[model samples]
Target chain A: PFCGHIKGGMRPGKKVLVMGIVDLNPESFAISLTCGDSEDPPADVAIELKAVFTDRQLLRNSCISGERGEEQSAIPYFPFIPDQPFRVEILCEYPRFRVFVDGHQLFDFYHRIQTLSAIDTIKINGDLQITKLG
Target chain B: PFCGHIKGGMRPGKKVLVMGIVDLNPESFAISLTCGDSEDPPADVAIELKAVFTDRQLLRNSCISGERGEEQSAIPYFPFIPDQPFRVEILCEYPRFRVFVDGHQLFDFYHRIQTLSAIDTIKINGDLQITKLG
Candidate 1:
C-alpha cells in the first residue's frame, strides 16, 4: 500500500498516470484520491476506484466527511488480467474524471467533491506492483 | 511482482530480511529464493514461503527442475495480520531455514535444494507493500 501527499493537489486537465503489473493471483486492488491523510476520522475521498478481479468490476465511490456514497459499477469491459501489464490514465475533466486503461477508455467518474483542489493525497494498495506513478 | 538477483547468493549463517505492510484486504502473498530468474521452464525455487491468510497458514516448499516437493504447513502460530507492518527474518542455518515474523519464531523448512549458494535470486509478490529487502 502507498499513501503520499500530492505536491500541488489536483486540477482540471491534469492527468494522473499509473503503470504497473497485475499480480498472478490478484484478488483486488484500489486507487484513491483523497482530501487529507488523516486516519482518525478517515480522510474525505474525492474518488476511489477499486478493481475486483473475481467480479471483474471497477467499483467507484467517494466519502465526504465520513459517509460513503453509492458505488458505480457500470463499465464497457474489464481490461485487467492476471500477470499482465497495465497502464491507467486518469484525465481530470470539468464534469468528471475520464479513465483509460492500456489506452482504451474504461469509464468516467463524476466530480463527487466540488473542490477538486482539495484532493491532496493519492493512495494505492492491494495485489499489484506500482512501477510508475505521475 | 518483484524479482531480482542476489549479489552473492545464499550461505549458512546468512540472514534474509524483509520489511513491509500487509494490504488491508489481502488474499495472500509469496516470497521465493530461487536458483535463477527463468520463466519458460520455470526456475528452481530453493525455498518458497507463502502466507495464506484465508487458512491462516504459512506454506513452505521447493521446486527443483520444475517438480515441486510436498508443502510443509506446520506453523506454530500465525504472526501476520492485514493492514499491519511486518518484518520477516529468514536465518539460513546448516540444516534448515529458521523463519521469524516480527521477532517471533514462526517455522522452519529443512533444506531441500541442498546447494545453498545456488539460490541466486529473491522474489516477492502479491497483496503487500515491500518497504525493504536485505
Candidate 2:
C-alpha cells in the first residue's frame, strides 16, 4: 500500500517490519525492495514479492528482473484473511533476504544485485491497510 | 500450562520466540519464564504473562512472585483473534524483558530476580495451538 526509503539503506542485520490488515474482498498484495526511492516508478527492484488469490488458491512469486521467478508453492496453505491484522518481516542477509509472516518463515529471495547497500527503498500495495512499516 | 528448561539458561541477548494459533473458543493463554522447570511446581516464576479475555476485554499481566504484579492496561487494544496465527517474541535484556507481538512492541517486564541467568525454563499453554517455541 506504500513505498518508502530505507533511511540508511539495507544492512545485513537490518530487518523491515510491516504490520497491516488485509482489506475486505482482498484479491492480492505485494511488497518490493528496490534500489531507488523515486516517487513515481521504482528504478531497480531487487526483491519483488506478490501474493495472488485466484481460483481460491493462494499463489506467491518473486521477481528479480521483468520476468517472474519460481513460484513458492511449498507453503502449506495461505494464512491470511480479510480485515485481520498481520505482521510481515523482511530480514536482510548476506546472500538473500528472508521473509516471515506471522513469525513463520515464508520464503527467501536471494540477492540479485551485488551491491546490497543499493536496496534503499520498499514498495507495498494491493488490498491491504498498512499500520506500521519500518 | 507447560514448562521446560531453557537448555543453557537465559542470556542477555537470548530471545524466546513463540508461534501459535489461537483456538476458536479462546478465553485466555499465557507464556511464563521461570527459574526451575519442576513438574510439580515451578521454583520461581520470574516472568509470568497471562492474557485473559472476559467480557470481551483483553487483560494482560506479569507476575513475579506469589503476589500478582500490576496489570498492563496501557495497550491500545488486543490484536489476537480466534483460529488466527500469531508470533510472540520475548527478548531478554539487562534490566527487563521486551515483549513484541506481531512485530509490535507490546510492553516491557522489568527483572524482578537479580540473577538473570537463573531464568532457565519457559511455560506456555491455554487456548492456543503452539506450532513452534524456542
**What lDDT does each candidate get?**
0.86, 0.73
Give candidate 2's error at residue A46 in angstroms.
62
Tens-digit per-residue lDDT, A1-134, candidate 1: 58877777788998888899999989889999898888777889988999877536678999997899998876656678889999999888999999999999988899989898888788899999989888
Q: Give interface RMSD, every candidate, in order.
A: 15.1, 15.9
Clashing pairs in 1: none
Which residue ranges in model 1 land beyond 4 Å of their true spot?
Answer: A1-134
- Candidate 2 RMSD to the real structure: 18.7
lDDT of 1: 0.86
Give the C-alpha miss distance for residue A72 in model 2, angstroms: 48
Best by TM-score: 1
In the predicted model 2, the residue pairs found to clash are A1-A124, A1-A125
Candidate 2 error regions (>4 Å)? A1-134, B55-65
Question: Tens digits of per-residue lDDT for model 2 on A1-134?
Answer: 47787887888989999899988877788878877756444366777766554422334444444555655443334557778998989999998888888998876767767688878888888989899986
Chain A TM-score (model 2)? 0.83
> What are the root-mean-square deviations of the candidates from the true structure over C-alphas?
17.4, 18.7
Cand. 2 TM to true fold:
0.47
